[PDB]
């Protein structure tokens, strides 16, 4: 996986084609049916019983595990259609960050046919409601940090990393994670500003890929310092079955996540999650 | 054997289905271009009558079609049409629909090897196997032409390779016609060697020029040349052997052979000459260009071994054609070329084509292309080296492809043996310096006290094109390092293993500056 | 003997197709076929 | 860099750069004649430039720095030179004032470096394909020996000097004043990165990299002036590592390494696959021998047809002056002609000549006979070469699998996609090819272009089925088209096609699976299957396909292929007029595709057997008057969708399916 700032035209073109192929499908592995995993309608914890909830673990000792499983499931679904490489990730932590111009447009010209076409990144249609997600803009992300300073998001990241045990790092990690959600969602009804329709906008996967990257650099820093990075204060919380990823087929067509529903073997992402990262770079300054 | 030979070339065929039409008619085929240009390739007849019992063949009928397509240039993989015309006995045109439309078939090469039969002449026997009858017949049938001063005289014949020059244009003689360096060398020299058999036969030859296996241990020059003069009383005049000297119609002098001590050096077992290992090394590799660049110096050696230090001998390219040992050796050269094809057949890698000299193959072939210089109608239409690989088309053969009195089976066994272990090589660059020279090299380690590693050979006159070999000529020094007791790993070792001291000696005894030639390099070859 | 079975439920007479034949091929067990050596004998002929 | 260039002593940037030119201590300072140690054309050139970069990094580290020298990526296309060097004077708000850039120019012995950019750098490559520099550097990787790598590596290296310098002596175009512009360090760092890619790929291949086996004689010699005592070079690590047997393991030695080994977004295995695919097909080379002419100059190539004019074929560039050791490359130097060969559609073995013209930087024409006879050679493709050991190739995109083990998720996905295809209705239009309606004409009568009973039969069905499955995957099915096996005895009809109806969780509702039947467009009727009571528990299909596969030639194979193809078609068609029996309509059912998939499979199997046996397989020996002309329905452009159906329509092209169509199979096993 690579950041979206080192992708040329052809990769964007292939990715757009794959996304449209995913989108127009109306299958059990359809885009809507996989966005179902992170929002309404409610099917959590046991869809057979009466209680209605969303299995999106929020503010608990399993958030990184759950969202990493989600992103790897999305990667597995996408790579079938022809994705040569991993999903790109957008670095909102970049100073003077802006909305990704790859997605900020609405329509673009396919040069192979020399004709205009609707860009999937612009919006996606909510299936049952029959509506679409509309983004919103605010100047907070696009503010220019001054000469030699650091931005609010960057210092937030630093004040998230200085801690030396997982058992509390996650709380500030989450509270800073929620910020770009509303920052990109704005006051629009349907957007990432609320979890009611969180997954119905493609930027979601980019944002959480960046999340997983930060969690990985957390592990790298901790192993450099020589401390136990395993979430040992959740020993009775990890062993819970991460529904709906732990159900039975055909509800979970993919099998890798189903077999890895135990978080105890998810720390080593370089081996058992069939993906990796090009660089551990953070703000032009490495882990050493 | 004739039909086996015919099957070798590929064929294009028109395939038909035939039946009974209860009448008789004349059928004519018509091959037509896409642009409606039709040619009548052939015709035949169909026989039947009202009283016959209806019939049809269970298989195809084939008609040869290659002639018209190859004459008009329409290749097999092109597009065209085939049409059938029927003419009745009673002068009535007939419907072509009565016959099905035909098909086109392609019979490919037959890479199998055929043991051809030829008359017991134009079969180049080994020199030692010759008997008294053959020897006397050859010497008489060569002196007869040697004493001819006409246009077909031996001096005019040998003027091609040597001097006086007649190239690149016969009208203005600039430089010699000898073709060297470029890969077409074996082609030019093999065809030149063949060229004299026509003259010999037409002047009374009995067998073709024998090949001398210098790879076998050599006590000295064979007695055929070593002889001086013999008496037979048929003309009541002693005959001097024409296999020692040669008249020059220009210089009024004669060549003088000279042996060299190293020519008598023997191998470890003593059943092969010192050049046997180099011969196997030449045979070893696969690509044709690498083969020829490794193979030129091989025959270049003997010229210096036997030409001595004389301006008029085999040591100089200007006058080397004026001594029959030239022909004797180039016969064995062609032997090596031919025996390479049998080794090629094992992996079946393409050999007839030259993937590395596509521009060079189709080049106009001097000087036989123009009828002015030679008037042998058989070779007047062979200015393409591409049509020279299939030497069976050139109407000769060899008694056996054996080398060193041994079979290709033991050849490949020895190649495998020499490939088993590791090797260390010396790679020399080489290019024309307008003279002939010796490259003597000695491997010396840190001590500075060393042995004589070996020597290689280079030739070039003063009226030849400039030329540089494509790749690096490789020589074996692994055994010499073994007597020096330096393991091949020591070359890689961080210790200073050794180096080499090379030098070049001119023919007349002078020594050219070492700057005239590049810096030799050390190569390593792992085990397989 | 040859009969024609159709999808309609009917037959067709065998005369529409050419009568077939029977073919037998021996096994590929053959190893050597060519003669070890020919005979090199000269034969004379009349001049005419 | 400001501090380093202001410095003048033995720690000075000026001296560390003057290493590469005048004044001279080469070969040894104690010699009546002195040259430069810029080993150009030698076998130690990468070693020397790696040492230079290491020395530069060590020297700059002492001026308050953290990381290594960034490498400018000239391989990746750009529209403008980097802005880090574009500016001449920039405003720093740390002092709140502008001041001149330290990259725009470099003051050396009373003069400054000068830049003269040329527009030929700013070409915009056409979409899909790389640029000239990219392909030149790319063709230096497949060669498994550093011995041949070095020449292409250095030619790519010195291309940029003429590309960007211009025609000024006081510039980096000439070797004399090329080590003083700052960007030279950046460029050589990037070239070192290219070499690092080389040995990474070498390690991937498994062959040794840190011990070359070509020029050990010269490689034993220590380098100068990187080995004299510290009085000439302040630092010590380079001096101690002067001997070049150790500048390979950079990560173990000098404690530094890159991060992005990717080249134009290509991973190492991905570019390995790409270069193998490129090598698959045959090609042509121009071959040169190179030696100094004391004047660095460009060389242009043009092919002159004896039966026609002469045309140019691009150009490359070489370095050379009067103050360097003479060099002679050991072997030939390659240049590409394939693009112009395709453009001029001249045959691969036609009669022509290639002529080289040498032009100085100014534009003067030096004599065009300074390099001997330039050669031209031809290289056969990987398919053409044979090793008689399997095939050993992996493809991407489509991977067709046996549906009997396909899991239910993708099964539901693909049936849903097919239902959507029936919904939009273009399925009828695409399937109308194989039979009625009359999408074809012959003998002045509405007919069908259903190719049957000829050698081009398997070709036409393979192309048709692949086009149909591509149109299906346009609906984003989870997997590609599967194949229904029948070689193993069938206990009953396959589950996916005989199951009554499906139950989708999206609506949590039942619906009838389309695989039973489909309404033929505007006909008033629907299809209907009819199984036959002798389709089960028989080895007749197995033994028939075996005795069809036993054959050797191709035309004979074709006829038994067609026979067994129509066999099970008629068997399963049954009495039904509108079924798999009558081919006028039989292509309207998904069983058609599920059958033709294995129809193609057995052809691929026969291809594999022919490859193993060594007989000619790709080339055919029948219908030679037709094999050039592509299939009739696919010749046109309006009906056919795009790409393969309009370009790779040649029956001669059809054979190379694994490369020109990019779809493999799950396995080549044939009934265990
Ligand atoms: C996913 O499915 C949707 C269908 O809802 C696809 O959108 C439609 O795609 C087709 C291509 O198969 C477009 O047809 C083309 O339209 C252009 C413009 O009129 C025309 O020039 C072409 O000849 C062709 O007919 C169609 O226009 C398009 N729908 C709209 C409203 O534009 C979408 O392409 C699919 N995504 C994929 C395959 O990745
Ligand atoms: C000159 O020779 C040709 C070839 O032998 C004769 O052509 C023959 O012509 C007769 C009648 O003109 C054809 O008879 C036809 O037979 C079919 C049944 O097969 C019948 O249905 C027709 O009504 C007609 O009677 C005969 O087929 C044809 N020969 C061939 C081989 O087709 C021609 O008649 C001869 N000229 C004269 C003046 O007889
Ligand atoms: C013995 O052989 C050597 C070469 O193997 C001969 O040396 C060649 O000829 C001359 C010396 O005789 C030298 O080159 C010539 O120099 C003159 C000087 O004016 C020049 O005009 C000629 O054009 C030619 O370049 C050199 O040593 C060598 N020629 C080369 C290498 O091209 C030598 O002459 C022979 N011995 C005798 C006694 O002839
Ligand atoms: C057998 O099937 C054939 C195929 O249609 C039928 O043959 C055709 O029948 C029609 C009318 O019955 C005729 O006009 C055609 O001339 C026939 N053609 C041929 C080639 O036979 C036939 O009807 C079917 N058998 C039965 C008993 O109906």
| DSSP assignment of D490-552 | PSSS-HHHH-SEEEETTTTEEEE-TTS--BPTTSS-B------TTSSS--HHHHHHHHHHT--
Residues framing ligand 4 (Cβ under 6 A): C 6, 8, 10
Q: What residue has token string 């219908």?
A: D623
User: CB-based burial of residue D337 (10 Å sphere; 0-12 exposed, 13-18 middle, 19+ buried)?
Assistant: buried
Pairing of strands B423-428, B473-476: antiparallel
C-alpha Rg value of chain A to the nearest Å: 19
D64 vs D87: CA distance, rounded Å: 23
Q: Please report, in angstroms and rounded to a whole number, the separation of the first and last CA atoms in chain A.
A: 22
Q: Rounded to the nearest 10 degrees, what angle do helices D146-165 and D183-205 cross at? A: 160
**B320 Cβ below 6 A of ligand 2:** no
Chain D positions in Cβ-Cβ contact with residue C9 (cut-off 8 Å)? 575
Query: For D587, which DSSP code?
Result: G
Cis peptide before A41 (omega within 30 of 0): yes
Residue B525: phi, psi to the nearest 5?
-125, 120
Yes or no: say if D135 and D30 are a contact pair by the CB < 8 Å rule.
no
Yes or no: say if D175 and D324 are a contact pair by the CB < 8 Å rule.
yes
C-alpha Rg value of chain D to the nearest Å: 33
The alpha-helical segments, DSSP class H, found in B147-205 are 154-158, 185-203
Mutate to test the interface with D, among C7, C10, C28 (most CBs of D within 10 A): C7
**Buried b / exposed e along D538-568 (16+ C-beta atoms within 10 A):** eeebeeebeebeebeebbebbebbbebbbeb
Structure tokens at B472: 């690096």
CA atoms in the 13 A half-sphere facing the CB of B204: 11
**B97 Cβ below 6 A of ligand 2:** no
Q: Please report, in angstroms and rounded to a whole number, the separation of the first and last CA atoms in chain C.
A: 58
Task: Report the gap between the CA of D13 and the closest CA in chain A (Å).
Answer: 25
CA D14 vs CA B9, D9, D324: distances in Å:
71, 8, 20
B278 vs B426: CA distance, rounded Å: 13
Residue B423: phi, psi to the nearest 5?
-145, 150
Chain D positions in Cβ-Cβ contact with residue B108 (cut-off 8 Å)? 616, 621
Helices and strands (H, E) in chain A, number of each type: 11, 2
Pairing of strands B473-476, D663-665: unpaired
CA B482 vs CA B478, B479, D452, D525: distances in Å:
6, 5, 70, 90
Identify which ligand lies nearest to the alpha carbon of D421. Answer: 1
Q: Measuring CA to CA, which residue among D437, D443, D629, D586 is closest to residue D522? A: D437
Q: How many CB atoms lie within 10 A of CB B475?
A: 22
3-state secondary structure D92-127: ECCCCEEEECCCCCCEECCEECECCCCHHHHCCCCC
Q: Measuring CA to CA, which residue among D627, D607, D605 is closest to residue D615? A: D607
Q: Measuring CA to CA, which residue among D210, D201, D257 is closest to residue D53? A: D257
Yes or no: say if B211 and B195 are a contact pair by the CB < 8 Å rule.
no
Yes or no: say if B222 and B127 are a contact pair by the CB < 8 Å rule.
yes
Identify which ligand lies nearest to the alpha carbon of D637. Answer: 1
Which are the contacts of D144, defined by CB distance < 8 A and separation ≥ 6? D202, D205, D207
Within an 8 Å CB–CB cutoff, is residue D470 touching chain A? no
Nearest CA in chain D to C9: D575
The CA dihedral of D101, D104, D107, D112, to the nearest 10 degrees, is -150
Secondary structure (DSSP) of B101-137: --EEEEE------------SSSEE-BSTT--HHHHHH
Within an 8 Å CB–CB cutoff, is residue B218 touching chain D? no
Classify B28 as helix, strand or coil.
Answer: strand
Sign of CA dihedral D170, D172, D174, D176: positive
Residues from C contacting D (CB-CB < 8 Å) are: 7, 9
Structure tokens at C6: 């159709």
Identify which ligand lies nearest to the alpha carbon of B90. Answer: 2
Chain D positions in Cβ-Cβ contact with residue B525 (cut-off 8 Å)? 213
Atom number of ligand 1 nearest to Cα A24: 1
Task: Report the gap between the CA of D592 and the closest CA in chain B (Å).
Answer: 30
Yes or no: say if D460 and D627 are a contact pair by the CB < 8 Å rule.
no
Which are the contacts of D451, defined by CB distance < 8 A and separation ≥ 6? D457, D459, D460, D631, D632
Structure tokens at D623: 């219908």
Yes or no: say if D159 and D133 are a contact pair by the CB < 8 Å rule.
yes
- CA angle, D260 as apex, D254 and D264 as ends, to 5°? 135
B504 vs B511: CA distance, rounded Å: 6
Flag if C9 and D573 touch (Cβ within 8 Å): no
Classify D661 as helix, strand or coil.
Answer: coil
CA A183 vs CA A37, A92, A137, B380, D15: distances in Å:
23, 11, 7, 89, 54
Nearest CA in chain C to D580: C7
Yes or no: say if A137 and A186 are a contact pair by the CB < 8 Å rule.
yes
Q: Rounded to the nearest 10 degrees, what angle do helices A152-161 and A166-185 cross at? A: 160
Which positions 206-265 of A are in contact with D (Cβ < 8 Å)? 249-251, 253-254
- Neighbouring-strand partners of residue B505: B438
Mutate to test the pocket of ligand 4, among C4, C7, C8 (most ligand atoms within 8 A of CB): C8
D538-544 long-range Cβ contacts below 8 angstroms, 24+ apart: D538/D489, D539/D489, D541/D486, D541/D487, D541/D567, D541/D568, D542/D487, D542/D671
Q: Measuring CA to CA, which residue among D569, D405, D597 is closest to residue D495? A: D405
D438 vs B442: CA distance, rounded Å: 84
Task: Report the gap between the CA of A262 and the closest CA in chain D (Å).
Answer: 22
CA atoms in the 13 A half-sphere facing the CB of D63: 16
Q: What is the CA(B41)–ligand 2 centre distance, in A?
A: 28
Q: Rounded to the nearest 10 degrees, what angle do helices D457-473 and D590-613 cross at? A: 120
Q: What is the CA(D530)–ligand 4 centre distance, in A?
A: 21
Chain C positions in Cβ-Cβ contact with residue D582 (cut-off 8 Å)? 7
Nearest CA in chain A to D414: A27
Which are the contacts of C29, defined by CB distance < 8 A and separation ≥ 6? none
Yes or no: say if B270 and B331 are a contact pair by the CB < 8 Å rule.
no
Helices and strands (H, E) in chain C, number of each type: 0, 2
Structure tokens at B35: 């642009």
Q: Measuring CA to CA, which residue among A226, A214, A231 is closest to residue A161? A: A214
Yes or no: say if B227 and B135 are a contact pair by the CB < 8 Å rule.
no
**B505 Cβ below 6 A of ligand 3:** no
Yes or no: say if D283 and D369 are a contact pair by the CB < 8 Å rule.
no
Residue D35: phi, psi to the nearest 5?
-125, -170
B188 vs B208: CA distance, rounded Å: 19
B243 vs B227: CA distance, rounded Å: 8
Q: Rounded to the nearest 10 degrees, what angle do helices B288-307 and B185-203 cross at? A: 60
Yes or no: say if A195 and A42 are a contact pair by the CB < 8 Å rule.
no
Nearest CA in chain D to B34: D625
Q: Measuring CA to CA, which residue among D595, D460, D464, D483 is closest to residue D529? A: D595
Q: How would you classify residue B430: left for phi > 0, otherwise alpha for psi between -120 and 50, otherwise beta? A: beta
Yes or no: say if A249 and D408 are a contact pair by the CB < 8 Å rule.
yes
- Neighbouring-strand partners of residue B229: B240
Chain D positions in Cβ-Cβ contact with residue B526 (cut-off 8 Å)? 213
B281 vs B284: CA distance, rounded Å: 5
Return the number of CB contacts < 8 Å for C and D.
8
CA D465 vs CA B217, B284, D218, D360, D598: distances in Å:
70, 49, 60, 57, 11
Q: What residue has token string 């330039």?
A: D374
Secondary structure (DSSP) of D620-641: --B-TTTTTSPPHHHH-SSSS-
Atom number of ligand 3 nearest to Cα B506: 5
Q: What is the CA(B95)–ligand 2 centre distance, in A?
A: 11
Atom number of ligand 1 nearest to Cα D474: 38
A76 vs A259: CA distance, rounded Å: 14
Sign of CA dihedral B234, B236, B241, B245: negative
A238 vs B396: CA distance, rounded Å: 87
B490 vs B497: CA distance, rounded Å: 6
D601 vs D658: CA distance, rounded Å: 12
Method: cryo-EM
B22 vs B314: CA distance, rounded Å: 78
B368 vs B257: CA distance, rounded Å: 30
D298-301 long-range Cβ contacts below 8 angstroms, 24+ apart: D298/D162, D298/D358, D298/D359, D298/D360, D298/D361, D299/D356, D299/D357, D299/D358, D299/D359, D299/D371, D300/D356, D300/D357, D300/D359, D301/D335, D301/D354, D301/D355, D301/D356, D301/D357, D301/D374
Residue D437: phi, psi to the nearest 5?
-75, 175
Q: What is the CA(B188)–ligand 3 centre distance, in A?
A: 30
Regarding chains C and A, contact by 3 or more CB pairs under 8 A is answered as no
Q: What is the CA(B435)–ligand 3 centre distance, in A?
A: 9
User: CB-based burial of residue B401 (10 Å sphere; 0-12 exposed, 13-18 middle, 19+ buried)?
Assistant: middle
Yes or no: say if B288 and B282 are a contact pair by the CB < 8 Å rule.
no
Structure tokens at D66: 């953290």
Yes or no: say if D501 and D510 are a contact pair by the CB < 8 Å rule.
yes
Chain D positions in Cβ-Cβ contact with residue B514 (cut-off 8 Å)? none
Pairing of strands D663-665, D398-400: parallel
A261 vs A244: CA distance, rounded Å: 10
B385 vs A59: CA distance, rounded Å: 83
User: CB-based burial of residue A239 (10 Å sphere; 0-12 exposed, 13-18 middle, 19+ buried)?
Assistant: exposed
A41 vs A53: CA distance, rounded Å: 9
Q: What is the CA(A118)–ligand 1 centre distance, in A?
A: 9
Q: What is the CA(D632)–ligand 1 centre distance, in A?
A: 26
Yes or no: say if D184 and D178 are a contact pair by the CB < 8 Å rule.
yes
Which of B105, B520, B525 faces D622 most closely, judged by CB atoms? B105
Identify which ligand lies nearest to the alpha carbon of C10. Answer: 4
B187 vs B334: CA distance, rounded Å: 9
Structure tokens at B323: 């001594």
The alpha-helical segments, DSSP class H, found in B204-349 are 223-226, 276-284, 288-307, 325-347
Identify which ligand lies nearest to the alpha carbon of A112. Answer: 1
C17 vs C2: CA distance, rounded Å: 10
Q: What residue has token string 């990787």?
A: D141
Classify A81 as helix, strand or coil.
Answer: coil
Chain D positions in Cβ-Cβ contact with residue A29 (cut-off 8 Å)? 409-410, 413, 478
**B24 Cβ below 6 A of ligand 2:** no
Instruction: Give the CA diameter of chain A.
Output: 58
Chain C positions in Cβ-Cβ contact with residue D577 (cut-off 8 Å)? 7
Within an 8 Å CB–CB cutoff, is residue D574 touching chain C? yes
Mutate to test the interface with B, among D215, D216, D556 (most CBs of B within 10 A): D216
Q: Measuring CA to CA, which residue among B306, B315, B302, B300 is closest to residue B259? A: B306
Pairing of strands B25-32, B38-46: antiparallel
Chain D positions in Cβ-Cβ contact with residue A6 (cut-off 8 Å)? 260, 265
CA A174 vs CA A205, A212, B177, D556, D597: distances in Å:
16, 12, 88, 70, 51
The sheet carrying D353-360 orders its strands as D310-318, D297-304, D353-360
A92 vs D576: CA distance, rounded Å: 64
Task: Report the gap between the CA of D373 and the closest CA in chain A (Å).
Answer: 42
Secondary structure (DSSP) of A7-49: --HHHHHHHHHHHHHHHH--STTSHHHHHGGGSSSP--S-TTS
B468 vs B430: CA distance, rounded Å: 7
**Buried b / exposed e along B476-505 (16+ C-beta atoms within 10 A):** bbeebbeebebebebbeeeeebbbbebebe
The CA dihedral of D120, D125, D129, D133, to the nearest 10 degrees, is 20
Cis peptide before B316 (omega within 30 of 0): no
Interface chains of chain A (3 or more CB pairs under 8 Å)? D
Structure tokens at A228: 């136990």
D561 vs D549: CA distance, rounded Å: 9
CA D294 vs CA B183, D70, D150, D297: distances in Å:
30, 33, 21, 9
Secondary structure (DSSP) of D286-327: EEE--B--SS-EEEEEEEE-TTS-EEEEEEEEE---SSB---
Sign of CA dihedral B234, B240, B244, B245: negative
Classify D351 as helix, strand or coil.
Answer: coil
Query: For B491, which DSSP code?
Result: H
Q: What is the CA(D451)–ligand 4 centre distance, in A?
A: 24
Task: Report the gap between the CA of C6 and the closest CA in chain D (Å).
Answer: 9
Q: What is the CA(A204)–ligand 3 centre distance, in A?
A: 83
Q: Cα D66 to the chain's mean position, in Å?
A: 37
């Amino acid at each position: 996986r690579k950041d979206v700032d080192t992708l040329t035209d052809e990769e964007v073109y292939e990715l757009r084609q794959a996304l449209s192929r995913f989108q127009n499908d109306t299958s059990v592995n359809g885009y809507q049916s996989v966005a179902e995993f992170h929002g309404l309608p409610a099917r959590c914890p046991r869809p057979d019983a009466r209680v209605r909830y969303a299995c999106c673990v929020h503010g608990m000792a399993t958030f990184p595990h759950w969202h990493r499983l989600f992103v790897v499931q999305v990667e597995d679904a996408l790579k079938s259609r022809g994705l040569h490489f991993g999903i790109p990730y957008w670095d909102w932590t970049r100073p003077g960050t802006t909305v990704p111009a790859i997605a900020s447009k609405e329509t673009y010209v396919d040069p192979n046919s020399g004709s205009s076409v609707h860009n999937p990144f612009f919006n996606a249609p909510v299936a049952f409601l029959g509506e679409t997600t509309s983004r919103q803009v605010q100047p907070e992300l696009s503010t220019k940090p001054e000469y030699g300073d650091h931005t609010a998001l960057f210092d937030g990241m630093l004040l998230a990393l200085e801690q030396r045990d997982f058992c509390d790092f996650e709380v500030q990690f989450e509270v800073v994670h929620n910020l770009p959600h509303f920052l990109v969602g704005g006051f629009a009804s349907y957007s990432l500003s609320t979890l009611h329709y969180s997954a119905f906008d493609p930027i979601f996967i980019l944002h959480h890929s960046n999340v997983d990257r930060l969690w990985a650099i957390w592990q790298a820093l901790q192993i450099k310092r020589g401390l136990p990075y395993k979430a040992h204060c959740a020993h009775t919380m990890t062993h819970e079955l991460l529904k709906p990823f732990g159900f039975a087929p055909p509800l979970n067509s993919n099998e890798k996540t189903y077999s890895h529903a135990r978080p105890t073997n998810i720390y080593d992402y370089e081996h058992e999650l069939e993906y990796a990262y090009d660089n551990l770079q953070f703000g032009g300054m490495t882990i050493d | 054997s004739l039909i086996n030979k015919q099957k070798e070339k590929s064929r294009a065929f028109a395939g038909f289905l035939l039946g009974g039409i209860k009448t008789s008619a004349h059928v004519d085929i018509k091959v037509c271009t896409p642009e409606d240009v039709c040619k009548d390739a052939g015709d035949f007849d169909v026989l039947g009558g009202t009283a016959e019992m209806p019939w049809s063949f269970d298989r195809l009928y084939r008609y040869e079609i290659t002639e018209v397509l190859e004459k008009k240039g329409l290749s097999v993989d092109d597009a065209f049409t085939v049409k059938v015309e029927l003419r009745a006995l009673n002068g009535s045109i007939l419907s072509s629909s009565l016959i099905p439309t035909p098909s086109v078939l392609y019979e490919p090469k037959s890479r199998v090897t055929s043991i051809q039969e030829l008359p017991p002449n134009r079969v180049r026997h080994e020199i030692s196997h010759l008997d008294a009858r053959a020897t006397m017949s050859l010497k008489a049938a060569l002196r007869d032409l040697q004493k001819d001063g006409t246009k077909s005289g031996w001096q005019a014949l040998a003027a091609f390779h040597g001097v006086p020059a007649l190239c690149p244009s016969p009208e203005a003689p600039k430089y010699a016609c000898c073709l060297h360096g470029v890969p077409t060398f074996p082609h030019w020299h093999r065809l030149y060697t063949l060229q004299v058999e026509q003259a010999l036969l037409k002047h009374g030859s009995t067998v073709a020029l024998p090949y001398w296996d210098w790879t076998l241990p050599i006590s000295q020059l064979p007695s055929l040349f070593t002889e001086q003069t013999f008496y037979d009383a048929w003309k009541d005049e002693v005959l001097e052997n024409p296999f020692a000297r040669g008249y020059i119609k220009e210089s009024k002098g004669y060549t003088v052979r000279d042996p060299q001590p190293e020519l008598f050096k023997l191998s470890a077992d003593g059943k092969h000459s010192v050049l046997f290992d180099e011969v196997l090394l030449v045979l070893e590799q696969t690509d044709y260009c690498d083969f020829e660049v490794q193979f030129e110096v091989t025959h270049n050696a003997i010229h210096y071994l036997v030409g001595g230090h004389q301006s008029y001998s085999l040591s100089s390219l200007h006058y080397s054609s004026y001594d029959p040992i030239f022909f004797t050796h180039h016969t064995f050269v062609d032997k090596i070329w031919a025996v390479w094809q049998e080794l090629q057949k094992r992996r079946g890698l393409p050999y007839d084509r030259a993937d590395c000299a596509v521009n060079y193959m189709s080049d106009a072939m001097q000087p036989f292309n123009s009828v002015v210089l030679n008037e042998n109608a058989f070779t007047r239409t062979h200015a393409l080296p591409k049509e020279v690989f299939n030497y069976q088309d050139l109407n000769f053969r060899y008694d056996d492809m054996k080398l060193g009195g041994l079979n290709l089976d033991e050849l490949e066994e020895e190649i495998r043996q020499h490939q088993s272990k590791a090797r260390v090589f010396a790679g020399f660059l080489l290019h024309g310096i307008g003279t002939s020279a010796e490259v003597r090299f000695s491997v010396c380690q840190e001590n500075g006290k060393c042995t004589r590693a070996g020597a290689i050979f280079v030739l070039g006159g003063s009226l030849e094109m400039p030329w540089a070999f494509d790749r690096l000529y490789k020589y074996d020094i692994t055994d010499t390092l073994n007597e020096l007791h330096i393991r091949p790993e020591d070359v890689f070792n961080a210790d200073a293993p050794f180096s080499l001291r090379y030098e070049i000696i001119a023919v007349n005894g002078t020594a050219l500056p070492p700057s005239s030639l590049s810096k030799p390099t050390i190569i390593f070859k792992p085990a397989v | 003997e040859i009969k024609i079975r159709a999808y309609n439920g009917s037959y067709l007479e065998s005369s529409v197709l050419r009568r077939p034949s029977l073919i037998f091929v021996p096994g590929e067990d053959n190893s050597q076929d060519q003669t070890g050596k020919t005979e090199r004998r000269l034969i004379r002929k009349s001049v005419t | 860099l400001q501090s380093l260039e202001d410095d003048t002593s033995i720690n000075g940037f000026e001296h560390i750069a003057a290493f590469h030119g005048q004044p001279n201590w080469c070969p040894s300072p104690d010699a009546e004649k002195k040259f430069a140690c810029c080993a150009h054309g030698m076998a130690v050139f990468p070693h020397w430039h790696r040492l230079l970069t290491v020395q530069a990094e060590n020297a700059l580290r002492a001026k308050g720095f953290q990381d290594g020298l960034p490498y400018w990526d000239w391989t990746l296309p750009m529209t403008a030179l980097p802005e880090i060097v574009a500016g001449e004077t920039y405003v720093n708000p740390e002092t709140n004032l502008p001041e001149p850039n330290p990259f725009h120019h470099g003051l050396v012995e009373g003069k400054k470096t000068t830049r003269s950019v040329r527009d030929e750098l700013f070409e915009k490559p056409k979409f899909g394909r790389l640029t000239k520099i990219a392909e030149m550097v790319l063709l230096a990787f497949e060669q498994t020996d550093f011995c041949t790598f070095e020449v292409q590596y250095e030619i790519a290296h010195n291309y940029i000097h003429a590309l960007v310098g211009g025609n000024e002596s006081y510039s980096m175009a000439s070797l004399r004043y090329t080590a003083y512009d700052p960007i030279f360090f950046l460029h050589h760092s990037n070239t070192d990165r290219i070499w690092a890619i080389w040995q990474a790929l070498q390690h991937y291949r498994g062959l040794p990299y840190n011990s070359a086996n070509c020029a050990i004689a010269s490689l034993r010699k220590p380098l100068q002036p990187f080995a004299q005592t510290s009085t000439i070079n302040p630092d010590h690590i380079t001096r101690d590592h002067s001997v070049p047997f150790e500048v390979f393991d950079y990560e173990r030695s000098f404690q530094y390494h890159y991060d992005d080994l990717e080249f134009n977004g290509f991973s190492i295995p991905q570019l390995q696959r790409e270069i193998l695919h490129r090598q698959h097909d045959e090609r042509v080379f121009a071959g040169f021998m190179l030696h100094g002419i004391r004047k660095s100059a460009l060389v242009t190539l043009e092919v002159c047809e004896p039966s026609g004019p002469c045309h140019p074929e691009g150009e490359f560039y070489i370095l050379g002056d009067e103050y360097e050791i003479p060099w002679q490359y050991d072997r030939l130097f390659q240049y590409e002609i394939t693009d112009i060969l395709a453009k001029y559609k001249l045959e691969a073995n036609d009669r022509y000549s290639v002529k080289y013209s040498v032009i100085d930087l100014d534009g003067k024409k030096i004599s065009s006979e300074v390099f001997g006879k330039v050669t031209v050679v031809v290289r056969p493709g990987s398919e053409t070469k044979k090793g008689e050991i399997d095939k050993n190739i992996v493809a991407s995109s489509h991977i067709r699998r046996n549906l009997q083990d396909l899991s239910e998720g993708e099964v539901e996905s693909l049936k849903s996609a097919l239902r959507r295809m029936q919904d939009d209705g273009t399925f009828g239009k695409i399937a109308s090819f194989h039979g009625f309606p009359s999408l074809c004409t012959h003998e002045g009568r509405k007919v069908a272009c259903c190719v049957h009973g000829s050698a081009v039969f398997p070709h036409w069905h393979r192309l048709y089925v692949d086009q149909v499955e591509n149109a299906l995957l346009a609906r984003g099915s989870a997997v590609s088209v599967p194949y229904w096996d029948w070689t193993q005895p069938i206990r009953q009809l396959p589950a996916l096609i005989n199951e009554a109806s499906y139950f989708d969780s999206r609506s949590q509702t039942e619906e009838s699976n389309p695989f039973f039947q489909v309404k033929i467009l505007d006909t008033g009727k629907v299809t209907t299957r009819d199984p036959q009571p002798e389709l089960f528990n028989s080895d007749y299909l197995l033994n028939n396909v075996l005795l069809a596969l036993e054959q050797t030639s191709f035309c004979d194979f074709e006829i038994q292929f067609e026979i067994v193809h129509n066999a099970l078609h008629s068997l399963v068609g049954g009495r039904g007029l509108y079924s798999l029996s009558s081919l006028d309509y039989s292509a309207f059912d998904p069983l058609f595709f599920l059958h033709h998939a294995n129809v193609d499979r057995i052809w691929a199997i026969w291809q594999a057997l022919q490859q193993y046996r060594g007989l000619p397989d790709d080339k055919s020996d029948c219908a030679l008057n037709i094999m050039r002309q592509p299939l009739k329905p696919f010749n046109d452009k309006g009906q056919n969708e795009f790409d393969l159906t309009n370009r790779y329509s040649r029956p001669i092209d059809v054979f190379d399916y694994s490369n020109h169509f990019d779809y493999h199979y799950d396995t080549l096993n044939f009934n265990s």
